[PDB]
DNA sequence: GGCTTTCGTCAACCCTTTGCTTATCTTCCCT
């Protein structure tokens, strides 16, 4: 009687950001874009470490990739292209029964709120991760379908109602609940100040030889699409004891805090999609969490 | 007095890289000798030897494992199991840009020879791989030995196969002298008494275990004698070079 | 015990072979024992339905014990008994199947022979052991039977890490020159 | 009476496509072909497997081959050729009794619809699964016998009537129903956008180093030839409860979705093949299905 | 009397992480 999930049931991602190239502009000269180059500086400090206090007096030489604004341009510009694709319910590897019953159990999902939180995370500048601190104003210009949309002051921890994010999110929800696609050409102008140090994505490297190795595209400082995609889907205010929005994982798990906000207490995604497939009526934000997982994608089987 | 037709840059993809049970990679000289006798059958131009070189060749997969092929449910009677994934028998696939040079003897103009080889190659299949592209074949003749080297250097750039022979066995010398092993032919084990499940009922059939020789890759210009790169069907149910063992 | 094992093998399908098309296709089941290639260090393969057979006190099937210390050549030359030679040879048969196997034409002089290439078992087992022993890493590794190789072959059942075959990639030509 | 099938009856592949080399061009300069290079990135995420709530908290590091457009070209170009080969009834392993009576029951196959669906799968962009979505405008340029056609907007899930694909299908059906060969050089111009991620073939390979390993050809992103061969034969809209075209399989089996649409309901290739041989009046659509299987080829064990 | 479907049967690893080669070039001479 229990409809088990397919062993290879997987969903493709539906929010596809590009790698976010960072340029340097002014708050006035936004047409003068010079690429933020990744430099490499050798930096000496103290050994630190929680243990081993005997070698505290010894130095610490580490070679670190840095990325800074030049001292003639005070604004950091971040360019990326977010592609919201539709058909979020057609599993590319699990189409059949389970997948399709999840679709019919998720037809009345509030796609407007999911699209609103996605477009707000793009619009409030959450895709800027550590660049936002020290920025005097973060101006987001989202060009949808040749549609300039300017945002100036949006607080990030809560999704306050405005008309421009909702205006973009109307057709973003029309794409997500239906078919087709929409492309958001996103530019972030941040008055970080003269010569402020910007924070790109850092590569994962195991061969070492360099302590911090920033993500670069032909040398220009850039951000990983995955970081932007994590920040776009940071919409999950529906876990147990929800204080801040977290990214949408199947387990509600962020790995910096070393916790899982939705595992071990029967609101991880697999339990909810098993309930929704097996005719257990989810609540509204429950369906929004499951549909946000399907928009994020992943594989849910075995 | 020798005549050759060269097809340069034969981009072929989907090559059955499984040369044998213990060799996966470049197709052996039995494959290209089979291609030569295939045109001896379809086009009628009877081919003595073929010298083949590899411009490009990548086996699909990692550096230690080949990419297996997702099998399709094509056998009869296993319906019901067709919804699940088909079981995978090992057949590595590869892509390869080759340069082929066929020893032919021809008595007509070079244009109809080029057209016949082109019409064969348009319907040919290098090692089970679809011929993606190929340059227009050109005829060159080896009147003397300097002319033989002219034909040799007309296959530039390609890495041809030269035979270096078996000292003791295949594994030992592949580690020791570091040469590559490939199928130079087959060894007949038993006569086959059941011709019902075969291509022909009248052609005599034998179960075979592939014999191997040890070979090296040398660029065609660095090969001193072009006869050491031209593989042909020897009368030991094997293939062999005209120049013998490369020294 | 060894006779116990040879007879355990014989109550079952009972095939000992040096060449087979079972490695090419697991659905094939053609097993061929060539007599001329049996030597001192000739590794020898055997087949049972689903690789069945009892183990000894050290936890080995017949495939381990017949393949170390040249034990198959010892039974083959009859240092352990001529009635054991008979038992061994009762399992050493040539079973033939050409379905799901490659069939090519090889020129034999003014005519062609349809050769069905089946892989040498000694080449697979001894090559895997030697090229892992002699540190030859210009190779590919392939698990033959699939997810559970006991339906294929006793060597595929026991050597689950995969067989070593030669990486036969040629050197590339650099385009920028 | 009751002419049985051969045990190892086999047919050769008649639609032979080449590997789809991926290049980067502009919609303006579509002659600026630039090999999309398969890059290798390393990915930090959260491990979220059906049975992993205990390990959800910890991270998950995967090295993955990616392939993205460069940020100066907004168009993905796809290169392949498709060679349609005649003699679709000449079995190379099956005997001359079952295969010839199979053939003489199949001259009444309307090859025009088969060729129309083959060239429409070529032209609509069916060979471009995950990168035809998110494309602003697709454009297929088919060159055959020094004559060139262009297709802008062809919906891929149904075969609507247009004179250009039918005009190519005239010579493709002439080759398939007759002799010889024909070759269509296909140029896919897909306006994905600036730096949009492209989707080459992933490989079925045991790779300890790379969790996801893409298919490259000299590093250049490429797609598998049998992948495009699966795309071209995705014409089967004639199975039981037919909604979407599936690939022409002997059992109508998509193992990707875990469902075989022609297995068990007496509409697979073997039952219709025996009905065609043994004089049972085969329907037109089953006739075209059996002919499409013979065009695809395969060995048939039984 | 096969014959075709589905369920039961039988298993168990020690792995290693780039080169293979390495490109087709001017002396005499007289017109």
PDB file of N, CA, C and O in Angstrom, chain D residues 204-268:
ATOM      1  N   UNK D 204      29.319   6.829 -17.970  1.00  0.00           N
ATOM      2  CA  UNK D 204      29.043   5.760 -17.016  1.00  0.00           C
ATOM      3  C   UNK D 204      30.408   5.169 -16.700  1.00  0.00           C
ATOM      4  O   UNK D 204      30.775   4.132 -17.242  1.00  0.00           O
ATOM      5  N   UNK D 205      31.157   5.810 -15.810  1.00  0.00           N
ATOM      6  CA  UNK D 205      32.511   5.349 -15.520  1.00  0.00           C
ATOM      7  C   UNK D 205      32.814   5.315 -14.026  1.00  0.00           C
ATOM      8  O   UNK D 205      32.417   6.218 -13.285  1.00  0.00           O
ATOM      9  N   UNK D 206      33.471   4.258 -13.559  1.00  0.00           N
ATOM     10  CA  UNK D 206      33.882   4.221 -12.163  1.00  0.00           C
ATOM     11  C   UNK D 206      35.070   5.160 -12.026  1.00  0.00           C
ATOM     12  O   UNK D 206      36.175   4.848 -12.469  1.00  0.00           O
ATOM     13  N   UNK D 207      34.848   6.326 -11.435  1.00  0.00           N
ATOM     14  CA  UNK D 207      35.923   7.294 -11.292  1.00  0.00           C
ATOM     15  C   UNK D 207      36.071   7.718  -9.843  1.00  0.00           C
ATOM     16  O   UNK D 207      35.193   8.376  -9.289  1.00  0.00           O
ATOM     17  N   UNK D 208      37.191   7.348  -9.233  1.00  0.00           N
ATOM     18  CA  UNK D 208      37.439   7.724  -7.848  1.00  0.00           C
ATOM     19  C   UNK D 208      37.733   9.208  -7.751  1.00  0.00           C
ATOM     20  O   UNK D 208      37.356   9.859  -6.778  1.00  0.00           O
ATOM     21  N   UNK D 209      38.402   9.750  -8.761  1.00  0.00           N
ATOM     22  CA  UNK D 209      38.762  11.159  -8.738  1.00  0.00           C
ATOM     23  C   UNK D 209      37.570  12.067  -8.986  1.00  0.00           C
ATOM     24  O   UNK D 209      37.362  13.032  -8.254  1.00  0.00           O
ATOM     25  N   UNK D 210      36.783  11.763 -10.010  1.00  0.00           N
ATOM     26  CA  UNK D 210      35.661  12.631 -10.346  1.00  0.00           C
ATOM     27  C   UNK D 210      34.310  12.002 -10.081  1.00  0.00           C
ATOM     28  O   UNK D 210      33.965  10.997 -10.695  1.00  0.00           O
ATOM     29  N   UNK D 211      33.535  12.592  -9.177  1.00  0.00           N
ATOM     30  CA  UNK D 211      32.188  12.100  -8.917  1.00  0.00           C
ATOM     31  C   UNK D 211      31.401  12.176 -10.208  1.00  0.00           C
ATOM     32  O   UNK D 211      30.786  11.194 -10.626  1.00  0.00           O
ATOM     33  N   UNK D 212      31.412  13.339 -10.845  1.00  0.00           N
ATOM     34  CA  UNK D 212      30.748  13.473 -12.130  1.00  0.00           C
ATOM     35  C   UNK D 212      31.835  13.678 -13.166  1.00  0.00           C
ATOM     36  O   UNK D 212      32.655  14.585 -13.044  1.00  0.00           O
ATOM     37  N   UNK D 213      31.876  12.806 -14.164  1.00  0.00           N
ATOM     38  CA  UNK D 213      32.866  12.946 -15.218  1.00  0.00           C
ATOM     39  C   UNK D 213      32.178  13.123 -16.552  1.00  0.00           C
ATOM     40  O   UNK D 213      31.458  12.240 -17.008  1.00  0.00           O
ATOM     41  N   UNK D 214      32.406  14.264 -17.189  1.00  0.00           N
ATOM     42  CA  UNK D 214      31.773  14.536 -18.468  1.00  0.00           C
ATOM     43  C   UNK D 214      32.541  13.931 -19.623  1.00  0.00           C
ATOM     44  O   UNK D 214      33.646  13.413 -19.453  1.00  0.00           O
ATOM     45  N   UNK D 215      31.946  14.005 -20.808  1.00  0.00           N
ATOM     46  CA  UNK D 215      32.570  13.461 -21.992  1.00  0.00           C
ATOM     47  C   UNK D 215      33.289  14.561 -22.692  1.00  0.00           C
ATOM     48  O   UNK D 215      32.721  15.602 -22.988  1.00  0.00           O
ATOM     49  N   UNK D 216      34.551  14.322 -22.967  1.00  0.00           N
ATOM     50  CA  UNK D 216      35.332  15.300 -23.654  1.00  0.00           C
ATOM     51  C   UNK D 216      35.941  14.682 -24.861  1.00  0.00           C
ATOM     52  O   UNK D 216      36.042  13.466 -24.964  1.00  0.00           O
ATOM     53  N   UNK D 217      36.351  15.511 -25.795  1.00  0.00           N
ATOM     54  CA  UNK D 217      37.012  15.025 -26.974  1.00  0.00           C
ATOM     55  C   UNK D 217      38.090  16.046 -27.116  1.00  0.00           C
ATOM     56  O   UNK D 217      37.807  17.136 -27.590  1.00  0.00           O
ATOM     57  N   UNK D 218      39.300  15.727 -26.677  1.00  0.00           N
ATOM     58  CA  UNK D 218      40.420  16.670 -26.662  1.00  0.00           C
ATOM     59  C   UNK D 218      40.099  17.758 -25.697  1.00  0.00           C
ATOM     60  O   UNK D 218      40.441  18.914 -25.909  1.00  0.00           O
ATOM     61  N   UNK D 219      39.413  17.396 -24.626  1.00  0.00           N
ATOM     62  CA  UNK D 219      39.023  18.374 -23.643  1.00  0.00           C
ATOM     63  C   UNK D 219      37.752  19.067 -24.011  1.00  0.00           C
ATOM     64  O   UNK D 219      37.064  19.587 -23.152  1.00  0.00           O
ATOM     65  N   UNK D 220      37.425  19.098 -25.281  1.00  0.00           N
ATOM     66  CA  UNK D 220      36.265  19.828 -25.693  1.00  0.00           C
ATOM     67  C   UNK D 220      35.044  19.079 -25.354  1.00  0.00           C
ATOM     68  O   UNK D 220      34.928  17.915 -25.681  1.00  0.00           O
ATOM     69  N   UNK D 221      34.113  19.743 -24.705  1.00  0.00           N
ATOM     70  CA  UNK D 221      32.864  19.132 -24.388  1.00  0.00           C
ATOM     71  C   UNK D 221      32.262  18.520 -25.595  1.00  0.00           C
ATOM     72  O   UNK D 221      32.276  19.101 -26.672  1.00  0.00           O
ATOM     73  N   UNK D 222      31.709  17.352 -25.423  1.00  0.00           N
ATOM     74  CA  UNK D 222      31.109  16.604 -26.508  1.00  0.00           C
ATOM     75  C   UNK D 222      30.013  15.727 -25.937  1.00  0.00           C
ATOM     76  O   UNK D 222      29.976  15.448 -24.738  1.00  0.00           O
ATOM     77  N   UNK D 223      29.118  15.289 -26.811  1.00  0.00           N
ATOM     78  CA  UNK D 223      28.057  14.381 -26.422  1.00  0.00           C
ATOM     79  C   UNK D 223      28.266  13.044 -27.115  1.00  0.00           C
ATOM     80  O   UNK D 223      28.853  12.977 -28.199  1.00  0.00           O
ATOM     81  N   UNK D 224      27.811  11.982 -26.456  1.00  0.00           N
ATOM     82  CA  UNK D 224      27.977  10.633 -26.973  1.00  0.00           C
ATOM     83  C   UNK D 224      27.162  10.453 -28.245  1.00  0.00           C
ATOM     84  O   UNK D 224      26.083  11.029 -28.392  1.00  0.00           O
ATOM     85  N   UNK D 225      27.701   9.670 -29.182  1.00  0.00           N
ATOM     86  CA  UNK D 225      26.999   9.452 -30.443  1.00  0.00           C
ATOM     87  C   UNK D 225      25.752   8.603 -30.245  1.00  0.00           C
ATOM     88  O   UNK D 225      24.722   8.854 -30.878  1.00  0.00           O
ATOM     89  N   UNK D 226      25.811   7.610 -29.356  1.00  0.00           N
ATOM     90  CA  UNK D 226      24.625   6.799 -29.099  1.00  0.00           C
ATOM     91  C   UNK D 226      23.558   7.574 -28.337  1.00  0.00           C
ATOM     92  O   UNK D 226      22.380   7.215 -28.415  1.00  0.00           O
ATOM     93  N   UNK D 227      23.940   8.651 -27.648  1.00  0.00           N
ATOM     94  CA  UNK D 227      22.965   9.556 -27.050  1.00  0.00           C
ATOM     95  C   UNK D 227      22.124  10.249 -28.120  1.00  0.00           C
ATOM     96  O   UNK D 227      20.889  10.266 -28.047  1.00  0.00           O
ATOM     97  N   UNK D 228      22.784  10.794 -29.143  1.00  0.00           N
ATOM     98  CA  UNK D 228      22.073  11.420 -30.255  1.00  0.00           C
ATOM     99  C   UNK D 228      21.295  10.378 -31.050  1.00  0.00           C
ATOM    100  O   UNK D 228      20.207  10.660 -31.565  1.00  0.00           O
ATOM    101  N   UNK D 229      21.829   9.158 -31.149  1.00  0.00           N
ATOM    102  CA  UNK D 229      21.084   8.079 -31.781  1.00  0.00           C
ATOM    103  C   UNK D 229      19.816   7.720 -31.031  1.00  0.00           C
ATOM    104  O   UNK D 229      18.797   7.385 -31.641  1.00  0.00           O
ATOM    105  N   UNK D 230      19.863   7.783 -29.699  1.00  0.00           N
ATOM    106  CA  UNK D 230      18.653   7.637 -28.900  1.00  0.00           C
ATOM    107  C   UNK D 230      17.701   8.803 -29.114  1.00  0.00           C
ATOM    108  O   UNK D 230      16.480   8.624 -29.053  1.00  0.00           O
ATOM    109  N   UNK D 231      18.241   9.999 -29.348  1.00  0.00           N
ATOM    110  CA  UNK D 231      17.397  11.170 -29.576  1.00  0.00           C
ATOM    111  C   UNK D 231      16.652  11.094 -30.897  1.00  0.00           C
ATOM    112  O   UNK D 231      15.477  11.475 -30.971  1.00  0.00           O
ATOM    113  N   UNK D 232      17.338  10.668 -31.960  1.00  0.00           N
ATOM    114  CA  UNK D 232      16.744  10.673 -33.292  1.00  0.00           C
ATOM    115  C   UNK D 232      15.616   9.655 -33.375  1.00  0.00           C
ATOM    116  O   UNK D 232      14.549   9.937 -33.929  1.00  0.00           O
ATOM    117  N   UNK D 233      15.801   8.491 -32.761  1.00  0.00           N
ATOM    118  CA  UNK D 233      14.780   7.454 -32.780  1.00  0.00           C
ATOM    119  C   UNK D 233      13.699   7.654 -31.726  1.00  0.00           C
ATOM    120  O   UNK D 233      12.794   6.819 -31.629  1.00  0.00           O
ATOM    121  N   UNK D 234      13.739   8.742 -30.954  1.00  0.00           N
ATOM    122  CA  UNK D 234      12.684   9.030 -29.988  1.00  0.00           C
ATOM    123  C   UNK D 234      11.429   9.498 -30.718  1.00  0.00           C
ATOM    124  O   UNK D 234      11.099  10.688 -30.720  1.00  0.00           O
ATOM    125  N   UNK D 235      10.741   8.560 -31.376  1.00  0.00           N
ATOM    126  CA  UNK D 235       9.662   8.860 -32.310  1.00  0.00           C
ATOM    127  C   UNK D 235       8.419   8.083 -31.908  1.00  0.00           C
ATOM    128  O   UNK D 235       7.339   8.291 -32.468  1.00  0.00           O
ATOM    129  N   UNK D 236       8.570   7.171 -30.951  1.00  0.00           N
ATOM    130  CA  UNK D 236       7.531   6.197 -30.628  1.00  0.00           C
ATOM    131  C   UNK D 236       6.425   6.918 -29.869  1.00  0.00           C
ATOM    132  O   UNK D 236       6.508   7.105 -28.655  1.00  0.00           O
ATOM    133  N   UNK D 237       5.391   7.333 -30.594  1.00  0.00           N
ATOM    134  CA  UNK D 237       4.154   7.821 -30.002  1.00  0.00           C
ATOM    135  C   UNK D 237       3.013   6.841 -30.208  1.00  0.00           C
ATOM    136  O   UNK D 237       1.854   7.254 -30.296  1.00  0.00           O
ATOM    137  N   UNK D 238       3.321   5.551 -30.339  1.00  0.00           N
ATOM    138  CA  UNK D 238       2.332   4.573 -30.773  1.00  0.00           C
ATOM    139  C   UNK D 238       2.166   3.428 -29.785  1.00  0.00           C
ATOM    140  O   UNK D 238       1.521   2.427 -30.116  1.00  0.00           O
ATOM    141  N   UNK D 239       2.726   3.546 -28.589  1.00  0.00           N
ATOM    142  CA  UNK D 239       2.547   2.535 -27.564  1.00  0.00           C
ATOM    143  C   UNK D 239       1.190   2.714 -26.887  1.00  0.00           C
ATOM    144  O   UNK D 239       0.412   3.614 -27.217  1.00  0.00           O
ATOM    145  N   UNK D 240       0.890   1.836 -25.935  1.00  0.00           N
ATOM    146  CA  UNK D 240      -0.384   1.902 -25.232  1.00  0.00           C
ATOM    147  C   UNK D 240      -0.400   3.082 -24.270  1.00  0.00           C
ATOM    148  O   UNK D 240       0.542   3.269 -23.493  1.00  0.00           O
ATOM    149  N   UNK D 241      -1.502   3.841 -24.299  1.00  0.00           N
ATOM    150  CA  UNK D 241      -1.666   5.123 -23.603  1.00  0.00           C
ATOM    151  C   UNK D 241      -0.500   6.067 -23.904  1.00  0.00           C
ATOM    152  O   UNK D 241       0.276   6.454 -23.030  1.00  0.00           O
ATOM    153  N   UNK D 242      -0.389   6.427 -25.179  1.00  0.00           N
ATOM    154  CA  UNK D 242       0.747   7.199 -25.659  1.00  0.00           C
ATOM    155  C   UNK D 242       0.519   8.683 -25.417  1.00  0.00           C
ATOM    156  O   UNK D 242      -0.459   9.256 -25.909  1.00  0.00           O
ATOM    157  N   UNK D 243       1.421   9.304 -24.663  1.00  0.00           N
ATOM    158  CA  UNK D 243       1.393  10.742 -24.428  1.00  0.00           C
ATOM    159  C   UNK D 243       2.610  11.450 -24.998  1.00  0.00           C
ATOM    160  O   UNK D 243       2.462  12.399 -25.774  1.00  0.00           O
ATOM    161  N   UNK D 244       3.819  11.013 -24.637  1.00  0.00           N
ATOM    162  CA  UNK D 244       5.058  11.610 -25.108  1.00  0.00           C
ATOM    163  C   UNK D 244       5.829  10.622 -25.979  1.00  0.00           C
ATOM    164  O   UNK D 244       5.692   9.407 -25.808  1.00  0.00           O
ATOM    165  N   UNK D 245       6.628  11.103 -26.935  1.00  0.00           N
ATOM    166  CA  UNK D 245       7.484  10.191 -27.702  1.00  0.00           C
ATOM    167  C   UNK D 245       8.582   9.592 -26.837  1.00  0.00           C
ATOM    168  O   UNK D 245       9.303  10.305 -26.139  1.00  0.00           O
ATOM    169  N   UNK D 246       8.696   8.269 -26.886  1.00  0.00           N
ATOM    170  CA  UNK D 246       9.783   7.555 -26.243  1.00  0.00           C
ATOM    171  C   UNK D 246      10.706   7.018 -27.329  1.00  0.00           C
ATOM    172  O   UNK D 246      10.390   7.046 -28.516  1.00  0.00           O
ATOM    173  N   UNK D 247      11.880   6.554 -26.909  1.00  0.00           N
ATOM    174  CA  UNK D 247      12.842   6.001 -27.846  1.00  0.00           C
ATOM    175  C   UNK D 247      12.355   4.664 -28.381  1.00  0.00           C
ATOM    176  O   UNK D 247      11.670   3.907 -27.688  1.00  0.00           O
ATOM    177  N   UNK D 248      12.695   4.384 -29.637  1.00  0.00           N
ATOM    178  CA  UNK D 248      12.323   3.106 -30.235  1.00  0.00           C
ATOM    179  C   UNK D 248      13.218   2.035 -29.623  1.00  0.00           C
ATOM    180  O   UNK D 248      14.418   1.967 -29.901  1.00  0.00           O
ATOM    181  N   UNK D 249      12.641   1.240 -28.741  1.00  0.00           N
ATOM    182  CA  UNK D 249      13.277   0.116 -28.078  1.00  0.00           C
ATOM    183  C   UNK D 249      12.539  -1.137 -28.507  1.00  0.00           C
ATOM    184  O   UNK D 249      11.405  -1.052 -28.992  1.00  0.00           O
ATOM    185  N   UNK D 250      13.168  -2.310 -28.396  1.00  0.00           N
ATOM    186  CA  UNK D 250      12.424  -3.555 -28.630  1.00  0.00           C
ATOM    187  C   UNK D 250      11.262  -3.769 -27.675  1.00  0.00           C
ATOM    188  O   UNK D 250      10.258  -4.375 -28.068  1.00  0.00           O
ATOM    189  N   UNK D 251      11.359  -3.286 -26.440  1.00  0.00           N
ATOM    190  CA  UNK D 251      10.264  -3.375 -25.484  1.00  0.00           C
ATOM    191  C   UNK D 251       9.665  -2.020 -25.144  1.00  0.00           C
ATOM    192  O   UNK D 251       8.867  -1.938 -24.204  1.00  0.00           O
ATOM    193  N   UNK D 252      10.029  -0.968 -25.872  1.00  0.00           N
ATOM    194  CA  UNK D 252       9.568   0.381 -25.565  1.00  0.00           C
ATOM    195  C   UNK D 252       9.999   0.851 -24.195  1.00  0.00           C
ATOM    196  O   UNK D 252       9.234   1.530 -23.499  1.00  0.00           O
ATOM    197  N   UNK D 253      11.204   0.488 -23.784  1.00  0.00           N
ATOM    198  CA  UNK D 253      11.607   0.551 -22.389  1.00  0.00           C
ATOM    199  C   UNK D 253      12.530   1.734 -22.165  1.00  0.00           C
ATOM    200  O   UNK D 253      13.650   1.758 -22.684  1.00  0.00           O
ATOM    201  N   UNK D 254      12.073   2.705 -21.384  1.00  0.00           N
ATOM    202  CA  UNK D 254      12.959   3.716 -20.821  1.00  0.00           C
ATOM    203  C   UNK D 254      13.362   3.217 -19.434  1.00  0.00           C
ATOM    204  O   UNK D 254      12.584   3.188 -18.479  1.00  0.00           O
ATOM    205  N   UNK D 255      14.609   2.755 -19.338  1.00  0.00           N
ATOM    206  CA  UNK D 255      15.165   2.368 -18.052  1.00  0.00           C
ATOM    207  C   UNK D 255      15.568   3.581 -17.235  1.00  0.00           C
ATOM    208  O   UNK D 255      15.842   3.456 -16.037  1.00  0.00           O
ATOM    209  N   UNK D 256      15.620   4.752 -17.875  1.00  0.00           N
ATOM    210  CA  UNK D 256      15.823   6.007 -17.170  1.00  0.00           C
ATOM    211  C   UNK D 256      14.648   6.314 -16.253  1.00  0.00           C
ATOM    212  O   UNK D 256      14.841   6.704 -15.098  1.00  0.00           O
ATOM    213  N   UNK D 257      13.425   6.122 -16.743  1.00  0.00           N
ATOM    214  CA  UNK D 257      12.226   6.330 -15.946  1.00  0.00           C
ATOM    215  C   UNK D 257      11.742   5.065 -15.254  1.00  0.00           C
ATOM    216  O   UNK D 257      10.784   5.131 -14.481  1.00  0.00           O
ATOM    217  N   UNK D 258      12.371   3.922 -15.515  1.00  0.00           N
ATOM    218  CA  UNK D 258      11.964   2.695 -14.866  1.00  0.00           C
ATOM    219  C   UNK D 258      10.654   2.119 -15.347  1.00  0.00           C
ATOM    220  O   UNK D 258      10.014   1.366 -14.610  1.00  0.00           O
ATOM    221  N   UNK D 259      10.231   2.452 -16.562  1.00  0.00           N
ATOM    222  CA  UNK D 259       8.962   1.985 -17.105  1.00  0.00           C
ATOM    223  C   UNK D 259       9.178   1.493 -18.531  1.00  0.00           C
ATOM    224  O   UNK D 259       9.903   2.114 -19.316  1.00  0.00           O
ATOM    225  N   UNK D 260       8.602   0.333 -18.845  1.00  0.00           N
ATOM    226  CA  UNK D 260       8.640  -0.248 -20.183  1.00  0.00           C
ATOM    227  C   UNK D 260       7.222  -0.238 -20.735  1.00  0.00           C
ATOM    228  O   UNK D 260       6.374  -1.016 -20.284  1.00  0.00           O
ATOM    229  N   UNK D 261       6.963   0.635 -21.705  1.00  0.00           N
ATOM    230  CA  UNK D 261       5.592   0.843 -22.154  1.00  0.00           C
ATOM    231  C   UNK D 261       5.091  -0.231 -23.105  1.00  0.00           C
ATOM    232  O   UNK D 261       3.875  -0.355 -23.278  1.00  0.00           O
ATOM    233  N   UNK D 262       5.976  -1.003 -23.728  1.00  0.00           N
ATOM    234  CA  UNK D 262       5.547  -2.016 -24.683  1.00  0.00           C
ATOM    235  C   UNK D 262       5.845  -3.427 -24.196  1.00  0.00           C
ATOM    236  O   UNK D 262       5.843  -4.365 -24.994  1.00  0.00           O
ATOM    237  N   UNK D 263       6.084  -3.602 -22.902  1.00  0.00           N
ATOM    238  CA  UNK D 263       6.385  -4.907 -22.334  1.00  0.00           C
ATOM    239  C   UNK D 263       5.147  -5.462 -21.647  1.00  0.00           C
ATOM    240  O   UNK D 263       4.568  -4.806 -20.775  1.00  0.00           O
ATOM    241  N   UNK D 264       4.747  -6.668 -22.042  1.00  0.00           N
ATOM    242  CA  UNK D 264       3.664  -7.371 -21.400  1.00  0.00           C
ATOM    243  C   UNK D 264       2.293  -7.154 -21.998  1.00  0.00           C
ATOM    244  O   UNK D 264       1.363  -7.889 -21.648  1.00  0.00           O
ATOM    245  N   UNK D 265       2.130  -6.176 -22.886  1.00  0.00           N
ATOM    246  CA  UNK D 265       0.840  -5.909 -23.507  1.00  0.00           C
ATOM    247  C   UNK D 265       0.832  -6.268 -24.985  1.00  0.00           C
ATOM    248  O   UNK D 265       0.031  -5.710 -25.747  1.00  0.00           O
ATOM    249  N   UNK D 266       1.718  -7.188 -25.389  1.00  0.00           N
ATOM    250  CA  UNK D 266       1.757  -7.803 -26.722  1.00  0.00           C
ATOM    251  C   UNK D 266       1.950  -6.768 -27.826  1.00  0.00           C
ATOM    252  O   UNK D 266       1.384  -6.883 -28.914  1.00  0.00           O
ATOM    253  N   UNK D 267       2.747  -5.741 -27.539  1.00  0.00           N
ATOM    254  CA  UNK D 267       3.057  -4.718 -28.527  1.00  0.00           C
ATOM    255  C   UNK D 267       4.549  -4.423 -28.578  1.00  0.00           C
ATOM    256  O   UNK D 267       4.951  -3.360 -29.063  1.00  0.00           O
ATOM    257  N   UNK D 268       5.383  -5.346 -28.106  1.00  0.00           N
ATOM    258  CA  UNK D 268       6.821  -5.188 -28.234  1.00  0.00           C
ATOM    259  C   UNK D 268       7.258  -5.513 -29.660  1.00  0.00           C
ATOM    260  O   UNK D 268       6.444  -5.809 -30.537  1.00  0.00           O
TER     261      UNK D 268
END
